[PDB]
Amino acid sequence: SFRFCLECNNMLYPKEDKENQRLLYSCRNCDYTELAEDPKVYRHELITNIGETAGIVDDIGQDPTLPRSDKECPECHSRDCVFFQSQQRRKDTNMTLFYVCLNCKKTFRDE
């Protein structure tokens, strides 16, 4: 998540003040500049796990084509649950199941 100029709406780029030795975010079409809070200017993940469990919707229990199991919900302890494998579909994706209850909709595994 990156921020934008509050008066120009354009993207703010990181900058360093030579005299102050501080990190700043400065727009390019305007003189607006704001102090940087975090030092993590850039991050790149070679191996990532996002998109595995993020694929959750509140009304996934209304799908009739999804199998229904009897795994115990940690939160609601309901007798009815719906499970599915990982939404991320890379060639080396694990086959672990994600179980969703009909009340709390918490995603969990059998591991």
Partner 1 sequence: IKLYGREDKGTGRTIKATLPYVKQDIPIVIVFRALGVVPDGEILQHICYDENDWQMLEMLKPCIEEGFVIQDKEVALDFIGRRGSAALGIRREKRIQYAKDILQKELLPHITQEEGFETRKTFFLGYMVNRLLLCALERKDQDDRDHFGKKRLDLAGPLLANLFRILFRKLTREIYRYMQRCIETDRDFNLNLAVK
Partner 2 sequence: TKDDFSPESKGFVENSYLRGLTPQEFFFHAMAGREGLIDTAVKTAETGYIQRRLVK
Partner 3 sequence: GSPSEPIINFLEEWGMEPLEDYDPAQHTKSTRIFVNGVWTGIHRDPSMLVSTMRDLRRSGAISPEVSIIRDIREREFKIFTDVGRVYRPLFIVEDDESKDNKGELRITKEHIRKIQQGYDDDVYGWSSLVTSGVIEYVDGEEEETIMIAMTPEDLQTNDTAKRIKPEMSTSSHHT
- Check whether 81 is labelled as a binding-site residue: no
Residue of the chain from 10, 48, 62, 96 that contacts Zn ion (CB under 5 A): 10
- Check whether 8 is labelled as a binding-site residue: yes
Contacts 24+ apart (CB under 8 A), 38-44: 41/14
What are the two backbone dihedrals, phi and then psi, of residue 17, each rounded to the nearest 5 degrees?
-90, 120
Identify which of residues 63 and 75 has a Cβ nearer to partner 2 in the complex: 63
Beta strands in the chain (DSSP E): 13-17, 22-26, 33-35, 68-69, 81-85, 97-101, 107-108
* Least separation in angstroms between CB 61 and Zn ion: 10
Taking CB under 8 A as the rule, does residue 85 contact partner 2? yes
Instruction: Give the interface with Zn ion as residue ranges (CB under 5 A).
Output: 5, 8, 10, 27, 29-30, 73, 76, 78, 101, 103-104
